[PDB]
Amino acid sequence: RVKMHVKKGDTVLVASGKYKGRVGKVKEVLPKKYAVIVEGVNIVKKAVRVSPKYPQGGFIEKEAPLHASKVRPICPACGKPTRVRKKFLENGKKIRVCAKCGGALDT
């Protein structure tokens, strides 16, 4: 309960400490431990030479996790957190004044 955070699955830049200020994609929320996985911490793993799937060159990885409570919003600008009006019907959580939500698709 109360796993609710602000980071959605779209495209959002970094405000971290390693790759500070980096543009990142959908981010893929995993999960409710407060972690992200966008396109920032690219790592290579020490996987073995597992005869089928991990061929003969065992030393490879793709996208490495990273913490949620660090990344930050986009729109015609950059950051600036979201703001939700109950729209009377559905929701409209645009960026700080600079408009447009994040759901799109007839939102």
Partner RNA sequence: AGAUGGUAAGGGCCCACGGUGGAUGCCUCGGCACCCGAGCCGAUGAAGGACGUGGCUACCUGCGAUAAGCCAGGGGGAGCCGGUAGCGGGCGUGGAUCCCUGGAUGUCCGAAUGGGGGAACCCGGCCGGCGGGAACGCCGGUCACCGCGCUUUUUGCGCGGGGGGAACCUGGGGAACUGAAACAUCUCAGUACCCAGAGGAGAGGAAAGAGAAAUCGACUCCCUGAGUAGCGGCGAGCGAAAGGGGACCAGCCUAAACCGUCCGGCUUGUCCGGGCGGGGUCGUGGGGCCCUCGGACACCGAAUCCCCAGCCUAGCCGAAGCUGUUGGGAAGCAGCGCCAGAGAGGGUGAAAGCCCCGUAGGCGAAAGGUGGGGGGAUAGGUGAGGGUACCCGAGUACCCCGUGGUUCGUGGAGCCAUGGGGGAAUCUGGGCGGACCACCGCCUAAGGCUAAGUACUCCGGGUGACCGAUAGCGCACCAGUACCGUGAGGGAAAGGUGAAAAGAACCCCGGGAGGGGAGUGAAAUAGAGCCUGAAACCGUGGGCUUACAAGCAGUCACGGCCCCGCAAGGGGUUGUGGCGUGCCUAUUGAAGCAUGAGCCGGCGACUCACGGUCGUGGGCGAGCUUAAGCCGUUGAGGCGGAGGCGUAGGGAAACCGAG
Partner RNA sequence: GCCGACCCGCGAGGGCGGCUGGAGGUAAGGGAAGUGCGAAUGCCGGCAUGAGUAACGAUAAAGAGGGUGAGAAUCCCUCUCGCCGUAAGCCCAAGGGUUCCUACGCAAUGGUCGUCAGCGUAGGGUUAGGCGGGACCUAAGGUGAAGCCGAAAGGCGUAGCCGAAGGGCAGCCGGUUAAUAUUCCGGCCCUUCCCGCAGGUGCGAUGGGGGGACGCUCUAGGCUAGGGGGACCGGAGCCAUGGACGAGCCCGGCCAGAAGCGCAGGGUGGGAGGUAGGCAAAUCCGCCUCCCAAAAGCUCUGCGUGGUGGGGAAGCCCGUACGGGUGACAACCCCCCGAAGCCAGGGAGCCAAGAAAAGCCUCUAAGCACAACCUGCGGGAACCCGUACCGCAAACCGACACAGGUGGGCGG
Among 11, 39, 75, 80, binds RNA (CB under 7 A): 80
CB 45 within 8 A of CB 63: no
What type of residue sits at position 92? G
Among 12, 24, 32, 62, binds RNA (CB under 7 A): 32
State the nearest-atom distance from the C-beta of 91 to RNA, in Å.
6
DSSP assignment of the chain, as one string? -----S--SS--B--SSSS-S----------SSSB--SSS-B--------TTTS-S------B---BSTT-B--SSSS---EEEE--SSS-EEEESSS---S--S--
Among 22, 39, 65, 100, binds RNA (CB under 7 A): 65
Contact between 75 and RNA (CB under 7 A)? no
Among 18, 23, 42, 87, binds RNA (CB under 7 A): 18
Applying CB under 7 A, the residues found at the interface with RNA are 1-2, 4-6, 8-9, 15-18, 20-21, 28-32, 43, 45-49, 58-59, 61, 64-67, 69-70, 72-73, 79-81, 83-84, 86, 90-91, 96, 103, 105
